[PDB]
Amino acid sequence: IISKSYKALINLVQSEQLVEKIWYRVIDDSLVVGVKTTSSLKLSLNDVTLSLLMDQAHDSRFRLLKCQNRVIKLSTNPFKKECVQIITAVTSLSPLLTFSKFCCTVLLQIMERESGNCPKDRYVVCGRVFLSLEDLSTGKYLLTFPKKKPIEHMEDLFALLAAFHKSCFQITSPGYALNSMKVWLLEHMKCE
Amino acid sequence: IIKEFPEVYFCERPGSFYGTLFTWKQRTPFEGILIIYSRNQTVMFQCLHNLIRILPINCFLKNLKSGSENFLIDNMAFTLEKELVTLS
């Protein structure tokens, strides 16, 4: 009966997968959790966020848990053509490893902006992230520099693009041309 | 070990403990005291986990905010002795 009534709640509030899948990394003292969208979820039309919720079984106390959110668009072999939007959340770890362990739940909220009725505020529980010190001690989710240079799991890249400080500059040469940039990047900075 | 200061230990294990310093005063070789300088607290938890896994079953850790128990008792004793001397 309790199972029946859980499902009853779920259908009480309420098919096409709005979200592929979930992944999480740890960088230094940040948790980066990210989820990779699908064609159906249009970030032009929908403000999305990504909250994390602590299991109160672990969280005996009123720690507000905070999360900063980025969106990440990367184009896939532009040199139709596949884009990749993903959605990511960054928080501190050390508040959460008091009990050696924690199991957050990952909640994707969606609020439309066009319709001023505040009508369609969907939500999606996309997963559930476990961490433990026994996991980190075997690596397996950490990002630790140089030995893990050759990036062949792209989640590592999206974690670095979510955690890190982002700044965007525009460059204008009004009286020369601009071909120093690929050289500055490949030779002086020795970029892959 | 740093030669100049042989009470300081610099960890060389090459992932997630590199650039971590300890110190270890073994006063009264039952009752020692350990200080962990780390670059965040994830490493302090990752280090205490690895230590608790190694230690005996009876080895009782304890955190110190504001000094060691023996020293605080000695301090309280001296202060009370002076006060009672002054009242005598």
mmCIF file of C-alpha atoms in Angstrom:
data_model
loop_
_atom_site.group_PDB
_atom_site.id
_atom_site.type_symbol
_atom_site.label_atom_id
_atom_site.label_comp_id
_atom_site.label_asym_id
_atom_site.label_seq_id
_atom_site.Cartn_x
_atom_site.Cartn_y
_atom_site.Cartn_z
ATOM 1 C CA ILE A 1 0.000 0.000 0.000
ATOM 2 C CA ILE A 2 2.868 2.419 0.788
ATOM 3 C CA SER A 3 4.394 1.693 -2.643
ATOM 4 C CA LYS A 4 0.996 2.198 -4.284
ATOM 5 C CA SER A 5 0.600 5.578 -2.534
ATOM 6 C CA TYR A 6 4.162 6.747 -3.452
ATOM 7 C CA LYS A 7 3.240 6.143 -7.112
ATOM 8 C CA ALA A 8 -0.093 7.856 -6.390
ATOM 9 C CA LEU A 9 1.747 11.022 -5.193
ATOM 10 C CA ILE A 10 3.961 10.908 -8.297
ATOM 11 C CA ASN A 11 0.973 10.716 -10.666
ATOM 12 C CA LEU A 12 -0.886 13.221 -8.396
ATOM 13 C CA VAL A 13 1.490 16.112 -9.109
ATOM 14 C CA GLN A 14 1.677 15.179 -12.866
ATOM 15 C CA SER A 15 7.701 10.507 -21.406
ATOM 16 C CA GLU A 16 10.309 11.846 -23.885
ATOM 17 C CA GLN A 17 13.749 11.792 -22.194
ATOM 18 C CA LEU A 18 14.534 15.438 -21.416
ATOM 19 C CA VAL A 19 17.978 14.375 -20.129
ATOM 20 C CA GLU A 20 20.469 11.766 -21.283
ATOM 21 C CA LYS A 21 22.501 11.083 -18.181
ATOM 22 C CA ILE A 22 24.336 12.381 -15.134
ATOM 23 C CA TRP A 23 28.001 12.570 -14.196
ATOM 24 C CA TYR A 24 29.977 14.068 -11.386
ATOM 25 C CA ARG A 25 33.574 14.966 -10.709
ATOM 26 C CA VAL A 26 35.631 16.416 -7.885
ATOM 27 C CA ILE A 27 38.241 18.999 -8.782
ATOM 28 C CA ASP A 28 39.862 20.116 -5.558
ATOM 29 C CA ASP A 29 37.266 21.123 -2.922
ATOM 30 C CA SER A 30 34.352 21.400 -5.340
ATOM 31 C CA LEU A 31 31.857 18.950 -6.541
ATOM 32 C CA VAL A 32 30.848 19.397 -10.128
ATOM 33 C CA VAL A 33 27.736 17.589 -11.178
ATOM 34 C CA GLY A 34 26.540 17.842 -14.745
ATOM 35 C CA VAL A 35 23.757 16.501 -16.897
ATOM 36 C CA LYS A 36 23.630 16.294 -20.657
ATOM 37 C CA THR A 37 20.441 17.413 -22.312
ATOM 38 C CA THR A 38 18.535 16.343 -25.427
ATOM 39 C CA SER A 39 16.907 18.066 -28.424
ATOM 40 C CA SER A 40 13.576 18.438 -26.499
ATOM 41 C CA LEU A 41 14.914 20.903 -23.879
ATOM 42 C CA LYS A 42 15.350 24.345 -25.449
ATOM 43 C CA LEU A 43 17.481 26.648 -23.325
ATOM 44 C CA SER A 44 16.447 29.607 -25.526
ATOM 45 C CA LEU A 45 12.880 29.193 -24.167
ATOM 46 C CA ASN A 46 13.502 27.657 -20.745
ATOM 47 C CA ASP A 47 15.557 28.921 -17.836
ATOM 48 C CA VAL A 48 16.918 25.751 -16.216
ATOM 49 C CA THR A 49 18.674 25.217 -12.943
ATOM 50 C CA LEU A 50 20.197 22.306 -11.205
ATOM 51 C CA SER A 51 19.767 21.979 -7.422
ATOM 52 C CA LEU A 52 21.311 19.390 -5.165
ATOM 53 C CA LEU A 53 19.406 18.077 -2.153
ATOM 54 C CA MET A 54 20.995 16.366 0.821
ATOM 55 C CA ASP A 55 19.428 13.228 2.268
ATOM 56 C CA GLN A 56 18.327 14.367 5.795
ATOM 57 C CA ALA A 57 19.337 10.837 6.989
ATOM 58 C CA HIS A 58 22.933 12.164 6.638
ATOM 59 C CA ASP A 59 22.041 15.888 7.162
ATOM 60 C CA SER A 60 20.995 16.080 10.844
ATOM 61 C CA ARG A 61 21.463 19.926 10.661
ATOM 62 C CA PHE A 62 20.357 23.105 8.857
ATOM 63 C CA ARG A 63 23.271 23.489 6.499
ATOM 64 C CA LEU A 64 21.882 25.393 3.540
ATOM 65 C CA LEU A 65 23.639 23.796 0.531
ATOM 66 C CA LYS A 66 24.456 26.239 -2.271
ATOM 67 C CA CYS A 67 25.182 25.600 -5.954
ATOM 68 C CA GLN A 68 26.337 27.790 -8.830
ATOM 69 C CA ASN A 69 25.144 26.836 -12.227
ATOM 70 C CA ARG A 70 26.706 27.024 -15.671
ATOM 71 C CA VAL A 71 25.550 26.063 -19.090
ATOM 72 C CA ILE A 72 28.084 24.764 -21.559
ATOM 73 C CA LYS A 73 27.584 24.751 -25.354
ATOM 74 C CA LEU A 74 30.330 23.071 -27.380
ATOM 75 C CA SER A 75 30.170 22.440 -31.140
ATOM 76 C CA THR A 76 31.179 18.960 -32.299
ATOM 77 C CA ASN A 77 33.603 18.863 -35.291
ATOM 78 C CA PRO A 78 32.485 22.108 -36.994
ATOM 79 C CA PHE A 79 35.781 21.970 -39.018
ATOM 80 C CA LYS A 80 23.082 19.200 -38.975
ATOM 81 C CA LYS A 81 26.436 19.689 -37.137
ATOM 82 C CA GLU A 82 25.911 18.473 -33.561
ATOM 83 C CA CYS A 83 26.026 21.043 -30.747
ATOM 84 C CA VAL A 84 26.302 19.825 -27.142
ATOM 85 C CA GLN A 85 24.529 21.843 -24.405
ATOM 86 C CA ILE A 86 25.217 20.673 -20.905
ATOM 87 C CA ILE A 87 24.187 21.925 -17.466
ATOM 88 C CA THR A 88 26.349 21.803 -14.490
ATOM 89 C CA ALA A 89 26.389 22.719 -10.818
ATOM 90 C CA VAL A 90 29.310 23.416 -8.530
ATOM 91 C CA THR A 91 29.362 23.327 -4.781
ATOM 92 C CA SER A 92 31.792 22.790 -1.958
ATOM 93 C CA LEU A 93 32.637 19.342 -0.770
ATOM 94 C CA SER A 94 34.048 19.694 2.717
ATOM 95 C CA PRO A 95 30.639 20.580 4.224
ATOM 96 C CA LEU A 96 29.359 17.297 3.026
ATOM 97 C CA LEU A 97 31.994 14.778 4.023
ATOM 98 C CA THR A 98 31.286 15.015 7.761
ATOM 99 C CA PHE A 99 29.795 11.471 7.738
ATOM 100 C CA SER A 100 32.393 10.141 5.307
ATOM 101 C CA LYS A 101 29.567 9.905 2.790
ATOM 102 C CA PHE A 102 26.544 11.521 1.284
ATOM 103 C CA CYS A 103 23.894 10.845 -1.282
ATOM 104 C CA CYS A 104 22.485 13.967 -2.859
ATOM 105 C CA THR A 105 19.587 13.973 -5.230
ATOM 106 C CA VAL A 106 19.825 16.019 -8.365
ATOM 107 C CA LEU A 107 16.890 18.119 -9.297
ATOM 108 C CA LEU A 108 16.474 19.852 -12.608
ATOM 109 C CA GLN A 109 13.962 22.658 -12.532
ATOM 110 C CA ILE A 110 12.632 24.314 -15.617
ATOM 111 C CA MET A 111 10.736 27.569 -15.730
ATOM 112 C CA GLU A 112 9.430 29.111 -18.904
ATOM 113 C CA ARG A 113 9.792 32.850 -19.484
ATOM 114 C CA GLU A 114 7.487 33.572 -22.488
ATOM 115 C CA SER A 115 4.202 32.635 -20.741
ATOM 116 C CA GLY A 116 3.606 35.248 -17.990
ATOM 117 C CA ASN A 117 0.972 33.050 -16.250
ATOM 118 C CA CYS A 118 3.904 31.209 -14.521
ATOM 119 C CA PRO A 119 2.092 28.142 -15.924
ATOM 120 C CA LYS A 120 4.604 25.417 -16.796
ATOM 121 C CA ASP A 121 7.260 24.930 -14.109
ATOM 122 C CA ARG A 122 8.432 21.363 -14.686
ATOM 123 C CA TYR A 123 10.966 19.430 -12.662
ATOM 124 C CA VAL A 124 12.951 16.263 -13.232
ATOM 125 C CA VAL A 125 14.825 14.165 -10.713
ATOM 126 C CA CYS A 126 17.715 13.155 -12.869
ATOM 127 C CA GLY A 127 19.642 11.028 -10.505
ATOM 128 C CA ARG A 128 21.292 10.612 -7.262
ATOM 129 C CA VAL A 129 24.964 11.026 -6.616
ATOM 130 C CA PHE A 130 26.846 9.007 -4.016
ATOM 131 C CA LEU A 131 30.302 9.928 -2.859
ATOM 132 C CA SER A 132 32.561 8.538 -0.197
ATOM 133 C CA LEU A 133 36.115 8.878 0.937
ATOM 134 C CA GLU A 134 36.606 5.208 0.010
ATOM 135 C CA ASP A 135 35.714 6.218 -3.581
ATOM 136 C CA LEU A 136 37.968 9.257 -3.779
ATOM 137 C CA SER A 137 40.908 7.281 -2.263
ATOM 138 C CA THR A 138 40.856 5.088 -5.411
ATOM 139 C CA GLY A 139 40.658 8.144 -7.626
ATOM 140 C CA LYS A 140 37.817 7.264 -10.008
ATOM 141 C CA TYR A 141 36.162 10.704 -9.775
ATOM 142 C CA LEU A 142 38.985 13.122 -8.961
ATOM 143 C CA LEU A 143 40.744 15.402 -11.359
ATOM 144 C CA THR A 144 44.454 15.697 -10.432
ATOM 145 C CA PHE A 145 46.913 17.368 -12.796
ATOM 146 C CA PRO A 146 49.654 16.304 -14.624
ATOM 147 C CA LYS A 147 49.301 12.729 -14.990
ATOM 148 C CA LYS A 148 45.693 13.005 -16.257
ATOM 149 C CA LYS A 149 46.711 15.200 -19.192
ATOM 150 C CA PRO A 150 45.310 13.168 -22.128
ATOM 151 C CA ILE A 151 41.586 13.802 -21.843
ATOM 152 C CA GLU A 152 39.644 10.843 -23.288
ATOM 153 C CA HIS A 153 36.581 11.038 -21.017
ATOM 154 C CA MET A 154 34.853 14.251 -21.977
ATOM 155 C CA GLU A 155 33.242 14.603 -18.540
ATOM 156 C CA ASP A 156 36.712 15.700 -17.356
ATOM 157 C CA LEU A 157 36.590 18.539 -19.816
ATOM 158 C CA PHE A 158 33.110 19.598 -18.758
ATOM 159 C CA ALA A 159 34.129 19.567 -15.144
ATOM 160 C CA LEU A 160 37.039 21.967 -15.931
ATOM 161 C CA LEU A 161 34.780 24.162 -17.897
ATOM 162 C CA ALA A 162 32.272 24.323 -14.987
ATOM 163 C CA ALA A 163 34.517 24.768 -11.989
ATOM 164 C CA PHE A 164 36.949 27.255 -13.454
ATOM 165 C CA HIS A 165 36.871 30.994 -13.596
ATOM 166 C CA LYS A 166 35.654 32.064 -16.971
ATOM 167 C CA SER A 167 36.520 35.391 -18.602
ATOM 168 C CA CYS A 168 35.714 36.469 -22.187
ATOM 169 C CA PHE A 169 37.743 39.130 -24.016
ATOM 170 C CA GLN A 170 37.229 40.686 -27.346
ATOM 171 C CA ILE A 171 40.328 41.552 -29.369
ATOM 172 C CA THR A 172 40.392 44.202 -32.125
ATOM 173 C CA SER A 173 43.440 45.186 -34.149
ATOM 174 C CA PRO A 174 42.280 48.292 -36.086
ATOM 175 C CA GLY A 175 45.463 48.740 -38.168
ATOM 176 C CA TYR A 176 47.118 45.319 -38.503
ATOM 177 C CA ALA A 177 45.672 41.814 -39.029
ATOM 178 C CA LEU A 178 45.172 39.031 -36.444
ATOM 179 C CA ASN A 179 47.033 35.776 -37.058
ATOM 180 C CA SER A 180 49.189 35.845 -33.904
ATOM 181 C CA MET A 181 46.458 34.110 -31.901
ATOM 182 C CA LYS A 182 46.755 30.559 -33.156
ATOM 183 C CA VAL A 183 50.530 30.958 -32.813
ATOM 184 C CA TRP A 184 50.367 32.390 -29.265
ATOM 185 C CA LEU A 185 48.095 29.438 -28.444
ATOM 186 C CA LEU A 186 50.008 26.604 -30.132
ATOM 187 C CA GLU A 187 53.681 27.668 -29.722
ATOM 188 C CA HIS A 188 54.041 30.075 -26.735
ATOM 189 C CA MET A 189 51.364 28.235 -24.692
ATOM 190 C CA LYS A 190 51.934 24.773 -26.255
ATOM 191 C CA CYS A 191 48.246 23.882 -26.456
ATOM 192 C CA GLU A 192 46.673 20.577 -27.484
ATOM 193 C CA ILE B 1 61.795 14.918 6.540
ATOM 194 C CA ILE B 2 63.065 18.522 6.368
ATOM 195 C CA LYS B 3 66.655 18.409 7.761
ATOM 196 C CA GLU B 4 66.596 21.962 9.173
ATOM 197 C CA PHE B 5 63.373 21.039 11.116
ATOM 198 C CA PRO B 6 63.194 17.276 11.759
ATOM 199 C CA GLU B 7 59.742 17.684 13.414
ATOM 200 C CA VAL B 8 58.209 18.397 9.953
ATOM 201 C CA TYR B 9 57.261 15.844 7.285
ATOM 202 C CA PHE B 10 56.419 16.668 3.655
ATOM 203 C CA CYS B 11 54.308 14.047 1.884
ATOM 204 C CA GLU B 12 55.497 12.919 -1.611
ATOM 205 C CA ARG B 13 52.693 10.431 -2.514
ATOM 206 C CA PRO B 14 51.871 11.632 -6.062
ATOM 207 C CA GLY B 15 48.055 12.132 -6.086
ATOM 208 C CA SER B 16 45.861 14.146 -3.638
ATOM 209 C CA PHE B 17 48.390 14.151 -0.742
ATOM 210 C CA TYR B 18 51.368 15.781 -2.471
ATOM 211 C CA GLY B 19 52.328 19.052 -0.760
ATOM 212 C CA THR B 20 50.853 18.170 2.588
ATOM 213 C CA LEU B 21 52.815 18.767 5.754
ATOM 214 C CA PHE B 22 52.563 17.028 9.083
ATOM 215 C CA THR B 23 54.231 17.441 12.395
ATOM 216 C CA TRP B 24 54.360 14.811 15.097
ATOM 217 C CA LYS B 25 55.411 15.465 18.724
ATOM 218 C CA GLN B 26 55.510 12.089 20.543
ATOM 219 C CA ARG B 27 55.450 13.272 24.181
ATOM 220 C CA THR B 28 55.029 10.357 26.616
ATOM 221 C CA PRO B 29 55.000 7.813 23.792
ATOM 222 C CA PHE B 30 51.414 6.688 24.509
ATOM 223 C CA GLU B 31 50.059 10.255 24.211
ATOM 224 C CA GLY B 32 51.248 11.933 20.976
ATOM 225 C CA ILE B 33 50.030 14.994 19.016
ATOM 226 C CA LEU B 34 49.730 15.550 15.270
ATOM 227 C CA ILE B 35 49.177 18.722 13.225
ATOM 228 C CA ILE B 36 48.026 18.684 9.622
ATOM 229 C CA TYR B 37 48.663 21.510 7.197
ATOM 230 C CA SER B 38 46.758 20.957 4.041
ATOM 231 C CA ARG B 39 45.575 22.848 1.021
ATOM 232 C CA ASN B 40 41.889 22.280 1.702
ATOM 233 C CA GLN B 41 39.883 20.188 4.135
ATOM 234 C CA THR B 42 39.179 17.432 1.669
ATOM 235 C CA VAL B 43 42.766 16.461 2.112
ATOM 236 C CA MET B 44 42.419 16.605 5.892
ATOM 237 C CA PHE B 45 39.501 14.156 5.685
ATOM 238 C CA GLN B 46 41.231 12.001 3.117
ATOM 239 C CA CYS B 47 44.199 11.899 5.495
ATOM 240 C CA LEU B 48 42.336 11.113 8.707
ATOM 241 C CA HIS B 49 40.432 8.339 6.902
ATOM 242 C CA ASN B 50 43.702 6.786 5.773
ATOM 243 C CA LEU B 51 45.101 7.107 9.300
ATOM 244 C CA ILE B 52 42.044 5.641 11.111
ATOM 245 C CA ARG B 53 42.239 2.667 8.741
ATOM 246 C CA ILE B 54 45.849 2.060 9.909
ATOM 247 C CA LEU B 55 45.603 2.719 13.648
ATOM 248 C CA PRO B 56 44.810 0.270 16.477
ATOM 249 C CA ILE B 57 41.262 -0.323 17.740
ATOM 250 C CA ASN B 58 41.862 1.621 21.000
ATOM 251 C CA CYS B 59 43.784 4.593 19.503
ATOM 252 C CA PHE B 60 41.460 7.499 20.402
ATOM 253 C CA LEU B 61 41.880 10.568 18.141
ATOM 254 C CA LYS B 62 40.598 13.896 19.354
ATOM 255 C CA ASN B 63 40.494 17.313 17.746
ATOM 256 C CA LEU B 64 41.966 20.395 19.482
ATOM 257 C CA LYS B 65 40.598 23.881 18.875
ATOM 258 C CA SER B 66 42.539 25.750 21.578
ATOM 259 C CA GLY B 67 45.459 23.728 22.945
ATOM 260 C CA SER B 68 46.451 20.382 24.464
ATOM 261 C CA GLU B 69 44.679 18.966 27.562
ATOM 262 C CA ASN B 70 47.822 18.542 29.727
ATOM 263 C CA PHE B 71 48.859 22.146 29.065
ATOM 264 C CA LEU B 72 45.379 23.561 29.853
ATOM 265 C CA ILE B 73 45.215 21.594 33.126
ATOM 266 C CA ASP B 74 48.719 22.809 34.096
ATOM 267 C CA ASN B 75 47.632 26.390 33.283
ATOM 268 C CA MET B 76 44.396 26.087 35.340
ATOM 269 C CA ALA B 77 46.370 24.558 38.246
ATOM 270 C CA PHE B 78 48.962 27.370 38.249
ATOM 271 C CA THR B 79 46.256 30.089 38.043
ATOM 272 C CA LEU B 80 44.190 28.632 40.917
ATOM 273 C CA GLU B 81 47.352 28.162 43.011
ATOM 274 C CA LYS B 82 48.197 31.862 42.558
ATOM 275 C CA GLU B 83 44.618 32.921 43.411
ATOM 276 C CA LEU B 84 44.458 30.772 46.574
ATOM 277 C CA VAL B 85 47.958 31.983 47.571
ATOM 278 C CA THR B 86 46.707 35.570 47.157
ATOM 279 C CA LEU B 87 43.627 34.889 49.325
ATOM 280 C CA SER B 88 45.767 33.189 52.005
#
